[PDB]
Write a protein that binds this DNA or RNA. Structure first.
Ligand code: ET9
Ligand code: MG
Lengths: 553, 406
DNA sequence: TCGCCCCCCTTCGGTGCTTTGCACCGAAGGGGGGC
């Protein structure tokens, strides 16, 4: 039936009129399934016949349903969507089973044909005009418009959610101790009432939904565990994901690999240690989704590692508000991190991974800080609070970082846990120059038009060097000059540059870089014993800097 | 009452800013505050057919342990018509910065007695989130002058002058400056005789509907040069680059004779004796650094900018300017929480103090350049925010070359 | 030949700098999952 809820008024974008696009051909089965719904839709007042004063049109189709018998109708409203007003979407996120508490009695309900029970603004209906063609051209189409929310229209999901919220609110305030997770037309209902009173509350809720025109068929009224919910399986004491089947293929296309990485990311919420860095590397620099990509040896290894992880059974547990949340992070290599969130040891609420590279130049301490931030945000979304952290970094290391780094930084309450590899600073710059160490005055210059440059140095010990560089930049020659001084100095060096750029990168103590040149500098910094790094303004004739500046000229 | 016609600026649309996640305690507080507001008709429940949105959150102060709802209308204010173009804006008094002690009072609730133009309310929508996304967001829009909207002090302008008259009447040398939802009220009374007349103002405000600030100690910290009597090559290089930078701010500072003390390819730890012509240059530039710059004047038609550097041991330096290298004020903020283990707290508190000083001194907050990663700031700042206003800010990553301000 | 939401990974294009490339950032492409 159709709800007697009031319609929510909707407008076109200002200046625009409605769509006017002719219809295309569909199969015989599609016309019959569509006509059964179409004749039935008219019987139940979901649509009404129109004719030629209505100048708008849009084309229609259908698609198969996971309930294999049923067919799902869709009209191609891409044009009407473009001209329909913007909506502020109220679905802010996706509920997660790790955020559920243990409940004595659980029910899962679904509203049938939910869109088709919510009416559409009267003044807006004429823009939903369409036509049904039956075969190729035995006839042309007859014309209908929608009286209810159509599938495929930009506003339908939000007006369904708003309608569901309005209908549910009386029951919610009248039963504050009954959890209702409402996602689209899917209702999770938990409670601590014995099964007897629980089921009284359910039929009372169902009869409230039916007065407002939302029917709940028995076919989709789950009442026994395991409940199927949001792609998971809810047991009394634990939950699992529905089975994840990975592609297995002789020859892989870009599109195949994209599907695999998506599956693995989905699996990572409960399977610990999942990695996708080497599989995603294969997507880089490709040019077609149908292009065949051979797996590298590293990608085979990583795939095999993941496949071993996925053959093991796993489960999450539910949330106990009376205990702390704990987050533990491990390092996996090449900027990859994995984490578990738990309340009692070896009983994970969920897992996940962090593996983004932010910036051209970074270090493990920054990325660990980022993983912490991602986890903190995720915990707020699911549980409404942040967890306590267990991190593989020593307090000495962190304290060395936030006193020598110039940006404000922080990590909340955390306990060191010794699970190598530990997060480390891979070198430190001396705060004072080093007695007895050689002093290198470095500089490099490039010609912007020419693209040719030189890098070189002079020293307090009388050493000099000039190197010609081709196809470079200004900033590269300065980086190159520092490369040379690190290359030819001993284990202890003092260096003076006039590149704020180069000083800026290196003073942040990076340990990885998208640039092969900066990576070379990093390996050399890690091999040194002590390095002091000093800046001076250029072209002011400063002793040392001026001599080399001239030498590079 | 009849509303005042309000417009957005030509060619601008209303705000469209996502709500960020909130903790349990802030969501419960907002739900309690909004349902009471809805019952009193100050806000209305709306749906997704209103396409506008502004983030909402809550703060609770160090000594008023009830939650205050805070809606981040920065985007809405940026798009709202000027009210000095309608010339209903409020003038800043040059007396406020001269006072013994200045107390801040939150008078936001006076706005809720004035209705907002029916056609402008849609631009004020906000969305309360849901723990573990159990429900869709819940949306409201204002029916009255919103707390945090820049048009509320301007529309309520004529009325606050009426409510204030007898106080400023009776205390001609107390000065009161409205800024957004705040009254900044200063006097020269003794530390606790000042407090009692703040209570008198509260009672008069009550008859219809932070801590003590001390502007005298807002010491300016100038550029300073070290004092040694042994100076290395490296010491003189760091000093020459520092004054070379200061040559962009001050006039008649030069380096060529401190500059040639290093002639030659020297070792950075060699000890250079200072020429008398070097001491000639140095003690000279020390005294230029000693006193303020000549020719720097505030311009109210331009924005204020503020830059902050972390110095360590909980110290934080800052400069406020409008044109580069013409600082209206340089200073140094000092941590005092006691644990002294949290950079984001210190910086968030430094931004509040600097912005407070701008309101007291010039009547508006500056746009901050924050020495922090955006996503580090965003993860933690609201846990430390205690003001009913929010300044504009951006995120910068510039290493020090010079430790100019230390 | 459809809609709306979240997530990740890659790519691209705009912005601003005492720039001449570089680093940042958000949006849009692909994928996963939900109804
Ligand atoms: C979430 C939705 C409601 C509940 O989805 P649903 O699984 O409960 O389906 P519905 O209630 O209609 O039928 P049923 O409950 O009797 O089985 C449906 O109204 C429509 C919407 N939805 C779902 N998938 C699609 C889709 O691909 N394209 C479109 N445009 N919309 C879709
Ligand atoms: Mg359904």
């Amino acid at each position: 039936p159709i709800s007697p809820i009031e319609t929510v008024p909707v407008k076109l974008k200002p200046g625009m009129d409605g769509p006017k696009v002719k219809q295309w051909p569909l199969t015989e089965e599609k016309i019959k399934a569509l006509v059964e719904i179409c004749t039935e839709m008219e019987k139940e007042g979901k649509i009404s016949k129109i004719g030629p004063e209505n100048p708008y049109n849009t084309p229609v189709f259908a698609i198969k349903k996971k309930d294999s018998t049923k067919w799902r109708k869709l009209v191609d409203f891409r044009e009407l969507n473009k001209r329909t007003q913007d909506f502020w979407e109220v679905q802010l996120g996706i509920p997660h089973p790790a955020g559920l508490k243990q409940k004595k009695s659980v029910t899962v309900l679904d509203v049938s044909a939910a869109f088709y029970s919510v009416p559409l603004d009267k003044d807006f209906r004429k823009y939903t005009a369409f036509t049904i063609p039956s075969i190729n051209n035995e006839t042309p189409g007859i014309r209908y418009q929608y009286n209810v929310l159509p599938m495929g229209w930009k506003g339908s999901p939000a007006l369904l959610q708003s309608s569901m919220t309005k209908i549910l609110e009386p029951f919610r305030k009248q039963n504050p101790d009954i959890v209702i997770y409402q996602y689209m037309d899917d209702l999770y209902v938990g409670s601590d009432l014995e099964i007897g009173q629980h089921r009284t509350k359910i039929e009372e809720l169902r009869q409230h939904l039916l007065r407002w025109g939302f029917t709940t068929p028995d076919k989709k009224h789950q009442k026994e565990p395991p409940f199927l919910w949001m792609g998971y399986e809810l047991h009394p004491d634990k939950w699992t994901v529905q089975p994840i089947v990975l592609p297995e293929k002789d020859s892989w296309t870009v599109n195949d690999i994209q599907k695999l990485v998506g599956k693995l990311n989905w699996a990572s919420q409960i399977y610990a240690g999942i990695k996708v860095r080497q599989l995603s590397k294969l997507l880089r620099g490709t040019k077609a989704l149908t292009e065949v990509v051979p797996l590298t040896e590293e990608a085979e290894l990583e795939l095999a590692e993941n496949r071993e992880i996925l053959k093991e059974p796993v489960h999450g547990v539910y949330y106990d508000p009376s205990k702390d949340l704990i987050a533990e992070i491990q390092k996996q290599g090449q900027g990859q991190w994995t984490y578990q969130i738990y309340q009692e040891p070896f009983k994970n609420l969920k897992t996940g991974k962090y593996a983004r590279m932010k910036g051209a130049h970074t270090n493990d301490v920054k990325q660990l800080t980022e993983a912490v931030q991602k986890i903190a945000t995720e915990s707020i979304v699911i549980w409404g609070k942040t967890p306590k952290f267990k991190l593989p970094i020593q307090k000495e290391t962190w304290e060395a970082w936030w006193t020598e780094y110039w940006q404000a930084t922080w990590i909340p309450e955390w306990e060191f846990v010794n699970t190598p590899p530990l997060v480390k600073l891979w070198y430190q710059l001396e705060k004072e120059p080093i007695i007895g160490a050689e002093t290198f005055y470095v500089d490099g210059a490039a010609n912007r038009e020419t693209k040719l440059g030189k890098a070189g140095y002079v020293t307090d010990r009388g050493r000099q060097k000039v190197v010609p560089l081709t196809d470079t930049t200004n900033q590269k020659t300065e980086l190159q000059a520092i490369h040379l001084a690190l290359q030819d100095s001993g284990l202890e060096v003092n260096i003076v540059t006039d590149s704020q750029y180069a000083l800026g990168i290196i003073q942040a103590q990076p340990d990885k870089s998208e640039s092969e040149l900066v990576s070379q500098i990093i390996e050399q910094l890690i091999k040194k014993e002590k390095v002091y790094l000093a800046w001076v303004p250029a072209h002011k004739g400063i002793g040392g800097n001026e001599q080399v500046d001239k030498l590079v000229s | 009452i009849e509303t005042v016609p309000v417009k957005l600026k030509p060619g601008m649309d209303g705000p469209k800013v996502k709500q960020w996640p909130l903790t349990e305690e802030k969501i419960k507080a907002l739900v309690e505050i909004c349902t009471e507001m809805e019952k009193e008709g100050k806000i209305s429940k709306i749906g997704p057919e209103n396409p506008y949105n502004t983030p909402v959150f809550a703060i609770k102060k160090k000594d008023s342990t009830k939650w205050r709802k805070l809606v981040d209308f920065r985007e809405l204010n940026k798009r709202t018509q000027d009210f000095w173009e309608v010339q209903l804006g409020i003038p800043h008094p040059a007396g406020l910065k001269q006072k013994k002690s200045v107390t801040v009072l939150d008078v936001g609730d006076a706005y809720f007695s004035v209705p907002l133009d029916k056609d402008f309310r849609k631009y004020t929508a906000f969305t309360i989130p849901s723990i573990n996304n159990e429900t869709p967001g819940i949306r409201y829009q204002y029916n009255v002058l919103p707390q945090g909207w820049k048009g509320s002090p301007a529309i309520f302008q004529s009325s606050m002058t009426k409510i204030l008259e007898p106080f400023r009447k009776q205390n001609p040398d107390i000065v009161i400056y409205q800024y957004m939802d705040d009254l900044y009220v200063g006097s020269d009374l003794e530390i606790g005789q000042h407090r009692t007349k703040i209570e008198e103002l509260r009672q008069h405000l009550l008859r219809w509907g932070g801590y003590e600030l001390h502007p005298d100690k807002w010491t300016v910290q100038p550029i300073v040069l070290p004092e040694k009597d042994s100076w290395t090559v490296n010491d003189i290089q760091k000093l020459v680059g520092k004054l070379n930078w200061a040559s962009q701010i001050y006039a008649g500072i030069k380096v060529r004779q401190l500059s040639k003390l290093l002639r030659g390819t020297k070792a950075l730890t060699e000890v250079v004796p200072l020429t008398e012509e070097a001491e000639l240059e140095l003690a000279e530039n020390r005294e230029i650094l000693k006193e303020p710059v000549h020719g720097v004047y505030y311009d109210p038609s331009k924005d204020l900018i503020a830059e902050i550097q972390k110095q360590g041991q909980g110290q934080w330096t800052y400069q406020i300017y409008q044109e580069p290298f013409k600082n209206l004020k340089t200073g140094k903020y000092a941590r005092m929480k006691g644990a002294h283990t949290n950079d984001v707290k210190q910086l968030t508190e430094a931004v509040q103090k600097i912005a407070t000083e701008s309101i007291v001194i010039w009547g508006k907050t500056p746009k901050f350049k924050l020495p922090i990663q955006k996503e580090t700031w965003e993860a933690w700042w609201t846990e430390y925010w205690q003001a009913t206003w929010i300044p504009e800010w951006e995120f910068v990553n510039t290493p020090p070359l010079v430790k100019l301000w230390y």
